[PDB]
Amino acid sequence: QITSAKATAKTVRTSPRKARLVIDLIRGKSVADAISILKFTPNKSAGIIEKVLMSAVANAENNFDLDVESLVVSEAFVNEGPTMKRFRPRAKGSASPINKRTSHITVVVTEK
Amino acid sequence: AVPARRTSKAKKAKRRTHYKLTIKGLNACSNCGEMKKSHHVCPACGHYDGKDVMSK
Amino acid sequence: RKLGRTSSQRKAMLRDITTDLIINERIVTTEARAKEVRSTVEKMITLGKRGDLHARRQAATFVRNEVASVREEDESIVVESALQKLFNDLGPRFAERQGGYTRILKTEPRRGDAAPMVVIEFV
Amino acid sequence: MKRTYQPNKRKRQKVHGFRKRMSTKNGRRVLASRRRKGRKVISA
RNA sequence: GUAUGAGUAGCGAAAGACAGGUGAGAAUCCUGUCCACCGUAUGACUAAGGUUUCCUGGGGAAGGCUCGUCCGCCCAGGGU
RNA sequence: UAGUGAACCAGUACCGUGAGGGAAAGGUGAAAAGCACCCCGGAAGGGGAGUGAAAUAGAUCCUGAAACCGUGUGCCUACAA
RNA sequence: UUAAGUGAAUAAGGGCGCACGGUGGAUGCCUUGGCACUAGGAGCCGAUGAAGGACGGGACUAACACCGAUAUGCUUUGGGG
Ligand SMILES: [Zn+2]
């Protein structure tokens, strides 16, 4: 048999450093604690990893498993995606570039 | 002034040991067992002090 | 005190907020505005107790001059003008209560600014 | 303050037009030198 | 193509607050009330210049120095 | 990045009132057979199920190096120039 | 029990090795396009309105191409099935 369903979300418009903070608060914790943690952090990268955990839990339910109450978040990644590029007029004629970055967020949910 | 040199790969990860996030004060409710903040109105319960406040 | 703005803008704010809780008796705002409104509402209801007014002629500063609060007819559309409600309803509710007419609860941070929020009631 | 490129419609076609570049032997050089490249806009 | 500077400087003069709406989602959209600013002008009419930005009904990938259910933005129809 | 500046709707987009100056951008598989149907989600995006010899060939689509950014771990590090 | 002496292990984080991903398009292979020439043709077009263009023509029409109020085409002579 198998365990550990996956779920990803590609090219999400958040900076990748500011989403590596929230994923440090989940690694190794059960699924019961993690949703409760993510509901009470007022960051933008809270309301995304919520949806990634809920989709991973739903994959594990409605494809393979039972025992929603015995699942543990064992791995979580943030990888960098394709950056947009724009400009901005600085003073005295010149200009300066501006990155606009994207991240790839994955969550793996083993049993225990 | 102007930085003298490239800061290496090590001093990034030696500065950033105090750029953490922390959660503070998560307690179980008295009416649903759902982890909700202390000294705060429980959002899905509506049950501060065992009294329903959000009433119309 | 708590400084929020310039000088006259605080007076504008604390007259604007505290004529709500007189019409609606519930407000959702932030922390600091709520504590200043504690102080000012409890200073105005104790003018609500006297009935002189000097009770009328001091309440004509921290109350907006006319903001109607009408749910009433006998055969008219008669108007309670956000000060007459102090000298008719909120006055005699607290004839046995001492100070302390307000509760403050702690709900959620706002979405845009993460400003923590507050409900103010009376009883 | 006033900067330069303040447009009109009489001046930009009674200076850079077509009827002033088929009226010399230098407007003709300009038109024939632009047609060697194959430029779309020949004049105004 | 990607770093370091660093999640730093900046976010381009001005007064908002609450209740009820719509919506997966609201300080930033709609409505209501009160408050405030200009008032030889931040009010009205036209000449250049711009060239469909005008109106009606939808939409939220990019633009908007934040958010955005909104827009002088995107789609479709229509007006001199 | 070669070969015409131009293998692609190039003397075009864009820049200057004008004479003039002037780019980047090729490749799925043999066959579109380009993922019916179910689940999470407002959508984007994903996990099954299929097409296929192959989907880690899913349209930014042959192979996919280096700087750069992450995860896990066998050994070491808080009296040291 | 007292006294004297010798003292390991844990890492907020970091270094090296290994293993696995992401960004980015080098390298490998390929060809619609070019470069330099050979042999033959041809070496002018125009008031009977030229070169170059603007506007229009389709069921749907933004662009290219082709065509001109007889407008994605008309007549005739041969080819072709
Ligand atoms: Zn509860």
Residue where the block lists tokens 């119309």: B56
- Chain A positions in Cβ-Cβ contact with residue B35 (cut-off 8 Å): 33, 36-37
Per the CB < 8 Å rule, is A24 touching B19? no
- Resolution of this model in Å is 3.5
**Do the annotations mark residue C42 as ligand-binding?**
no
Question: Strands (DSSP E) along C76-123, which ranges?
Answer: 103-109, 116-121
Q: What angle do CA A55, A61, A65 make, to 5 degrees?
A: 135
Query: Which nucleotide C1' is nearest C5 CA?
Result: E15
In this structure, which amino acid lies at residue B29?
A: C
CB of B35 less than 8 A from some CB of A: yes
SS3 B40: coil
- How many angstroms separate the most distant Cα atoms in chain C? 49
Chains with 3 or more CB pairs under 8 A to chain C: B
| Partners of C17 in beta bridges | none
Distance from CA of B53 to the nearest CA of A (A): 21
Distance from CA of B43 to the nearest CA of A (A): 11
Specify the number of domains making up chain A.
1
CA dist C59 → C13, C38, C47, C66, C122 (Å): 16, 16, 7, 12, 19
Distance from CA of B39 to the nearest CA of A (A): 14
Per the CB < 8 Å rule, is B39 touching C106? yes
Per the CB < 8 Å rule, is B48 touching C105? yes
Q: Which helix (H) or strand (E) holds A12?
A: strand A8-12
Contact B40, B53 (CB under 8 A): no
CB of B53 less than 8 A from some CB of C: yes
Domain boundaries, chain D: 1-44
Q: Containing domain of residue A61, as a range?
A: 1-112
Count Cβ neighbours within 10 Å for each residue of B6-28 and write b for 16 or more, e otherwise.
Answer: eeeeeeeeeeeeeeeeeeeeeee
E10 C1' to A90 CA distance, Å: 11
Q: Which of residues 20-49 of B touch strand G (CB under 7 A)?
A: 20
Q: To the nearest 10°, the Cα dihedral for C96, C102, C103, C108?
A: 170
